[PDB]
Nucleic acid binder design. Structure first.
Lengths: 310, 148, 497, 103, 438
DNA sequence: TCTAAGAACTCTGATGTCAGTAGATTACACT
DNA sequence: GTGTAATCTACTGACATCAGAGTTCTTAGA
């Protein structure tokens, strides 16, 4: 969606900014409609819900006797819905306003807390705005800082704080926005460290072994002397196998009437597996691994094959 | 931990003292067979600890005693027995109020221990040195009644 | 520590005539200070760790109630999960009229004996049934010598306190306030785990923080397999989660009871009741309808046995930050499943960090789930500030995106800037720096929701109406930057808006 | 008292003993409702709570003095509402008072 | 009798303050009550106990029905319903005046409480109560139809219902048909569809681990259900086929099942209702018979008890089956009469396995007479000399009679049951053996 | 002269998870 | 058979999470 927004910095430097979504975990378009057997009509089923008090199974009237509560320790506050809209934290609106600027390493790769990654571009046909944004972008780039902007899709949406990363491509410079955590969201854990490995002790035989490994299985290696490594596993251009399986299933279930489902088409598996050459390179290094570590046992589970014939 | 301690003390009283604070603190937590073992550890050394009556009412020893579990009851009445000479009367009254309950109980061994308790009460409180302690008089009366 | 275990904090205030009415000046009051502390920490714990345990018990009082019927100790509310019906009780005492009520209900402050007081608190922690993770006792007194008079009481005190130290209980007092008499080497250097008249440690116990926490809970343990034969035991842990508000519960008008939703599915043609077997899933493509078994509608996803599938390794420049998909997770071996695997994990970690390259893998978090491609970017530990864990050592999980995600952008042309305005924008961007710490900000929504919750819970006169750093401080930007907005207007802006 | 039956209340506050407010109502049999829906007659509160501030911010209810119901208990007969007996009113009562009161 | 004082105190425990503390006192008080009044032996004092336990102004049932709002008494409810379960056995059928109230208590508890720990026993008590009060007219006043309504509804609450409570739910839906078929007349087919379908899902799985205990409950409920409302020779290729192939699936331990409820219950299903499946038995005869014998010797005593009954029914149904038609020759003269014959004639197998083997030699006396009369007398002979060498062992104490001549007499009965003539020359021997058994 | 379709976000409800607890089941075992 | 172990499998609290459903906004629009 062409979302335009006013990139706000200060109280007097508004810029029309066009927001665009870059990466979103795609969800299949239309849900599996629930249908009754042996009649195959959608309209024959009602997922009706009923609310019943615990005493003697008294049924309570559907949508005007229930008022939502919350747990606050032992007891339940009778909150409501009307009180909800009366006390909910308001907001002005889009309010994509820059809180400040900070160093690259001041934010870290790990901490990104987003649902989705926006791309933050200029509202079209206002050139001076575009160059203004471009100035912004280069300046952040060479000075190697990032921006932290209050974000909000709109009213009735929770506000949002995160990094504004600035990006460059020979066709165009780019600026992208990601959720970064609020404090309540961050978690903290001890995680007893490892360089106290008085119980694990990675001996040099193991050390140089793993060296040989991670070199040997190098999924990427430089090509064309341009340092464009052998990234013949981009994973970026690779279709989501989930959707592949889903459309395949729908197919075989259409082209045939009732027949049992097929296995995964071997080209999908070939697709997901690494290009063979890595597997070819892999046997000897792993081979030396198997004699250089302890590998005490583990467990396993079952299926319908637990009692399925053949 | 309780099991280990019990097995230790079962032939060695002295070691208990060093851990008996924990023995008590852990008491009300457990339920079931381990309770028996815990109170047994308590028994092994009950003859020495001072201010045991307070510490013992801390955990609901009175309510602990009422439970239908023969071994738990046997160890509880034995606890009563040993701490008998040391406890002041004003509270031996409250402590015998549930001991007297065990007249109706069926575990023959349990009743034998009851009558031992009440024997001792009767022997050592007959005609107290002072009549003012209405507590003492009442204890004597109740003991006599149940023993009859 | 044992997860089901819980953190328990008992509260214990000096109820003598000592500080009930010290009020040297007319700005605070030590009892009104301690009660404020207790109310504050308790409401903080309500939201924070609603599962924990608290208890409040005063000592030296004239009335009496405790488990053991001792003298001058009063257990205000026993150890129980926090709840409103208790904040109410504490609040009943906050105030000059409140302190009149406190004194005329339980006592002005009689004689006491901290030996016995600690006895009381000990019995309290004992009485609870659930398991206790940490056990902590907070005195709120100031008589920095509990008693210089009867030393025997003092010997008994040191003895029992050592015991409590040995029974697994810690103890801590914050020296509240005393004219002079603001020392801990007088009788407490051997109790708690230089000195002044007010405690910093009690300041933060008013900071009034209200997030929530969960312990070291493994999100899922799966076996990273290098190949079809080598496997290691990894615990997929989580390090950022986007706490949504606690899910509301449905209640009846007339009685505030739970209402036990009872959704069901049933027939329209007849008043029948479709049992779960008697349903079918469906789609509509190509004007033709489709049927699958409800079992099949999830069988259509079985792709790999659960775990991690490391394939190769990849130069960290190539794992572009430009394509985040979901919050990252963390990787750290769990010695429990495949014994010794922690070694190999460490080996991979050390070597990869040394040779500055990623590790790509297939992630099947649970059964029935399609796999995604995630990279095991290693992470070095950092401790420098105070030698406390900051970034835990191991591998990240940067999920790599799939082709169905790129969302082809509506191409537009570029217009470079002139070095003049970018040279000034250098100054602009320099001026508005600020160091960004991780926990800088808060959700206004979550925070305000929690607030309004306490508001409705405690029958307050007002909501707290928190002010939250999310909104920018406008005047600050107007000032610290100067009027450069008109500079960039005259540089790169014509009349039109 | 067989009068307050078929009349449904809301004792939203009251701490005069609040839990005894509805008890006194109970031997009079007044229908006791914890949270006022569109059905209820009026709402009774011995002070202001934030929910009171809500139901003020949504005029869909009639909000009453503490003393009024006590008087109706001391009339042994329901006393239909009067200007002092209220501390806020609903729009139906306001349009009724646009007939029934000087402004 | 201290039952009265103890009970009196129990209802006191309801109103004490520290409810989370009053709970423990109450719980082991009620345990004491149970221990006291299950031991009782005097047929007088026993009545006093009973009428105090099910008392009204107080008593265990009122304690439940009134301590049911609180959650602090989960353990107490659990023990009180367990003690009802034991009592119901201890005074079978005497509780007759209180059955209706017990049923109302059971259904009340099942509706109210949350934690399974109280639901499991709750359903258990209904199971016991129904199973013991079958005959009496009391059955009509449990309003069993309403019970079927309520629990059938329970079967559809988004399947949140936990596992073991679900297995007992299926148990009761089953045994409900058995106790009072008349009220189920218009509801049975629905329930069959339910059990069949849910069994299918739960055992013809694709991804989910088999909720074993759920399955055990399912098929045992099916067993109880087939007692009436038969399902053979009517819609067999659908209905009976599904039931049957599920039974096969249950029997087959396609992996070594460390737990035994599923096979045990399956064997019982087959045992008590092979009469339905008689048609399809011959389809899989080889597999069935193999699996059963192999199954006849695992250590679990209950399982062995299931297995023997299963084999007995299998052989019996097969024997009945052949007695009608002449194509299954390539069945007996290819598999049975040789495999069990080879058992007897070679093995050093178990005593029990030998007994079932001799049985098998017998039960096929029918087909023997259908196919060739001249073999009937021959097998009669062979059996009676087996007898003659198994009784005249010259006082072999403690080993030989132990499990055998019961079997042989069973067998000789079987064979004579179809002998045309009488080998009178051998006859006196037979009654000599009969006396020996006596 | 304006009415749907997608969008998007949030919210709710199940599914599956993990640690813990403890029960009942099943193996072991008695000369 | 009888009785005591060992130990698997359960349930629950609790926490993530897909999906599913309720809701506002742009274009194409009588």
């Amino acid at each position: 969606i062409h979302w335009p927004c006013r990139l706000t910095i200060g109280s007097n430097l508004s810029i029309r900014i066009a927001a665009y979504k870059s990466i979103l975990q795609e969800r299949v378009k239309k849900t599996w409609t629930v249908v009754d057997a042996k009649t195959l009509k959608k309209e024959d089923i009602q997922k009706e819900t009923v609310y019943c008090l615990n005493d003697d199974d008294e049924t309570e009237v559907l949508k005007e006797d229930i008022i939502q509560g919350f747990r606050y320790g032992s007891d339940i506050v009778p909150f409501s819905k009307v009180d909800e809209e009366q006390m909910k934290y308001k907001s002005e609106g889009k309010c994509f306003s820059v809180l400040g600027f900070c160093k690259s390493s001041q934010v870290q790769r790990r901490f990104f807390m987003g649902n989705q990654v926006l791309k933050v571009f200029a509202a079209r046909d206002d050139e001076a705005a575009a160059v203004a944004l471009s100035s912004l972008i280069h300046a952040l780039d060479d000075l190697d800082m990032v921006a932290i902007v209050r974000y909000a899709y709109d009213k009735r949406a929770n506000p949002q704080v995160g990094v504004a990363f600035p990006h460059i491509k020979h066709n165009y410079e780019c600026l992208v926005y990601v959720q970064l955590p609020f404090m309540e969201d961050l978690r903290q854990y001890m995680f007893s460290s490892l360089k106290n490995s008085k119980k694990y002790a990675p001996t040099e035989a193991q050390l140089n072994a793993v060296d040989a490994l991670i070199d040997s299985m190098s999924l990427a290696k430089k090509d064309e002397k341009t340092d464009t490594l052998e990234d013949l596993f981009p994973t970026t251009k690779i279709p989501n196998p989930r959707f592949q399986r889903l459309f395949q299933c729908l197919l075989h279930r259409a082209l045939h009437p009732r027949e049992p489902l097929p296995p995964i088409q071997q080209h999908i598996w070939n697709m997901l597996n690494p290009p063979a050459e890595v597997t070819t390179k892999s046997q000897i290094p792993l081979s030396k691994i198997k004699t250089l570590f302890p590998l005490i046992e583990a467990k396993k589970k079952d299926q319908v094959t637990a009692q399925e014939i053949f | 931990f309780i099991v280990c301690l019990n097995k230790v003390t079962k032939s060695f009283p002295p070691l208990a003292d060093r851990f008996m604070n924990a023995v008590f603190f852990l008491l009300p937590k457990f339920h079931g067979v381990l309770k028996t073992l815990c109170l047994e550890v308590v028994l092994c050394r009950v003859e020495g600890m001072t201010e045991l009556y307070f510490q013992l009412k801390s955990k609901d020893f009175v309510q602990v005693m009422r439970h239908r579990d023969d071994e738990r009851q046997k160890v509880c009445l034995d606890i009563i027995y040993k701490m008998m000479p040391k406890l002041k009367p004003v509270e031996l009254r409250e402590l015998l109020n549930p001991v007297v309950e065990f007249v109706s109980h069926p575990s023959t061994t349990c009743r034998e221990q009851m009558y031992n308790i009440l024997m001792w009460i009767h022997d050592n409180y007959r005609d107290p040195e002072s009549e003012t302690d209405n507590d003492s008089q009442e204890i004597f009366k109740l003991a006599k009644d149940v023993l009859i | 520590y044992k997860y089901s275990g819980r953190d328990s904090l008992i509260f214990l205030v000096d109820a003598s005539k000592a500080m009930f009415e010290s009020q040297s000046e007319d700005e605070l009051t030590p009892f009104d200070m301690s009660i404020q502390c207790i109310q504050s920490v308790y409401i903080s714990k309500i939201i924070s760790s609603d599962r924990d345990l608290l208890a409040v018990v005063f000592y030296g009082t004239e009335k009496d109630k405790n488990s053991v019927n001792f003298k001058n100790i009063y257990v205000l509310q026993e150890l129980d999960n926090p709840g409103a019906k208790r904040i109410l009780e504490l609040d009943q005492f906050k105030g000059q009229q409140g302190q009149k009520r406190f004194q005329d209900m339980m006592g002005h402050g009689s004689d006491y004996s901290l030996s016995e007081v600690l006895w009381v608190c000990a019995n309290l922690f004992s009485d609870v049934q659930f398991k206790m993770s940490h056990k902590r006792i907070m005195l709120f007194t100031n008589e920095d010598n509990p008693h210089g008079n009867d030393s025997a009481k003092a010997s008994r005190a040191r003895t029992k306190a050592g015991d409590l130290r040995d029974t697994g209980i810690f103890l801590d007092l914050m020296h509240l306030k005393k004219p002079g008499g603001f020392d801990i080497s007088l009788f407490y250097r051997d109790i708690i785990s230089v000195h002044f008249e007010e405690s910093s440690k009690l300041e933060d116990l008013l900071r009034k923080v209200r997030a929530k926490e969960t312990r070291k809970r493994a999100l899922s343990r799966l076996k990273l397999k290098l190949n079809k034969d080598i496997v290691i035991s990894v615990g997929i842990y989580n390090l950022v989660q986007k706490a949504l508000k606690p899910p509301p519960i449905k209640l009846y008008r007339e009685t505030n009871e739970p209402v036990k939703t009872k959704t069901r599915t049933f027939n329209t043609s007849t008043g029948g009741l479709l049992l779960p077997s008697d349903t079918k899933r469906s789609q509509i493509y190509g004007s033709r309808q489709i049927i699958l078994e409800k079992e099949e509608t999830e069988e259509l996803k079985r792709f790999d046995d659960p775990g991690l599938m490391l394939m190769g390794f990849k130069p960290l420049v190539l794992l572009k930050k430009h394509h985040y998909l979901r919050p990252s997770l963390f990787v750290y071996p769990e010695e429990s499943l495949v014994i010794g695997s922690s070694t190999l994990f460490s080996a991979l970690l050390i070597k990869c960090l040394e040779k500055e390259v990623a590790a790509l893998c297939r992630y099947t978090p649970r059964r029935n789930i399609p796999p995604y491609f995630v990279a095991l970017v290693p992470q070095e530990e950092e401790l420098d500030d105070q030698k406390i864990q900051v970034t835990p050592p191991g591998f990240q999980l940067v999920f790599l995106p799939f082709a169905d995600d790129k969302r082809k952008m509506p191409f537009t042309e570029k217009i470079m800037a002139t070095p003049e305005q970018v040279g000034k924008m250098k100054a602009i961007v320099e001026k508005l720096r600020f160091t960004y710490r991780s926990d800088s900000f808060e959700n206004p929504v979550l925070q305000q929701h929690f607030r309004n919750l306490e508001a409705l819970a405690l029958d307050l006169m007002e909501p707290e109406q928190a002010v939250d750093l999310t909104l920018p401080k406008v005047e600050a930007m107007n000032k610290r930057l100067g009027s450069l907005v008109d500079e960039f207007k005259e540089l790169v802006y014509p009349p039109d808006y | 008292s067989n009068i307050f039956e078929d009349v449904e209340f809301c004792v939203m506050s009251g701490t005069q003993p609040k839990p005894d407010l509805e008890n006194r109502i109970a031997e009079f049999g007044g229908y006791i409702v914890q949270n006022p829906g569109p059905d209820t007659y009026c709402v009774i509160a011995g002070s202001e709570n934030i929910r009171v501030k809500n139901i003020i911010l949504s005029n869909k209810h009639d909000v009453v003095k503490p003393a009024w119901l006590l008087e109706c208990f001391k009339t042994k007969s329901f006393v239909p509402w009067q200007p002092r007996f209220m501390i806020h009113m609903c729009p139906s009562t306001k349009e009724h008072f646009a007939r029934e009161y000087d402004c | 009798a201290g039952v009265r004082c103890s009970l009196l105190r129990l209802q006191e425990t309801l109103s004490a303050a520290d409810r989370c503390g009053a709970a423990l006192a109450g719980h082991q008080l009620i345990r004491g009550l149970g221990q006291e009044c299950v031991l009782s032996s005097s047929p007088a004092v026993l009545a006093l106990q009973t009428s105090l336990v099910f008392s009204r102004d107080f008593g265990l049932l009122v304690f439940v029905r009134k301590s049911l709002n609180s959650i602090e008494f989960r353990e107490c409810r659990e023990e009180i319903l367990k003690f009802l379960c034991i009592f119901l056995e201890k005074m079978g059928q005497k509780i007759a005046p209180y059955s209706v109230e017990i049923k109302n208590t059971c259904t009340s508890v099942y509706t109210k409480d949350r934690a399974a720990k109280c639901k499991i026993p709750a359903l258990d008590l209904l199971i016991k109560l129904l199973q013991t009060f079958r005959s009496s007219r009391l059955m009509d006043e449990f309003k069993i139809g309403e019970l079927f309504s309520k629990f059938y509804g329970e079967l559809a609450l988004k399947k949140k219902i936990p596992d073991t409570v679900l297995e007992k739910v299926y148990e009761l839906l089953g045994l409900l048909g058995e106790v009072h078929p008349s009220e189920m007349i218009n509801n049975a087919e629905n329930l069959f569809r339910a059990f069949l379908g849910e069994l299918k899902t739960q055992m013809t799985s694709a991804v989910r681990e088999p909720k074993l205990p759920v399955l055990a409950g399912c098929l045992k409920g099916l067993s109880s259900l087939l007692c009436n409302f038969t399902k053979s020779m009517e819609e067999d290729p659908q209905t009976s086929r599904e039931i049957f192939n599920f039974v096969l699936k249950a029997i087959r331990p396609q992996i070594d099942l460390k737990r035994y409820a599923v096979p045990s219950a399956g064997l019982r299903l087959f045992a008590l209702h092979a009469s339905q499946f008689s048609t399809c038995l011959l389809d899989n005869y080889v597999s069935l018979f193999e699996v059963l014998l192999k199954w006849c010797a695992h250590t679990n005593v209950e399982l062995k008890k299931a297995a023997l009954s299963a084999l007995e029914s299998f052989l019996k149904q097969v024997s009945n089956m052949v007695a009608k038609n002449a194509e299954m020759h390539k069945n007996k003269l290819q598999y049975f009469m040789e495999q069990f014959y080879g058992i007897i004639r070679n093995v050093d197998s178990n005593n029990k396995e030998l007994s079932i083997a001799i049985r098998g030699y017998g039960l096929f006396a029918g087909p023997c007479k259908v196919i060739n009369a001249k073999d009937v007398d021959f097998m009669y002979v062979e059996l009676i000399q087996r007898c003659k060498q198994m009784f005249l062992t010259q006082t072999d104490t403690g080993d030989d009679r132990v499990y055998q001549m019961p079997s042989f007499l069973q067998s000789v009965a079987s064979v004579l049951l179809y002998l045309d003539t009488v080998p009178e020359v051998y006859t006196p021997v037979l009654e000599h053996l009969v006396v020996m058994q006596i």
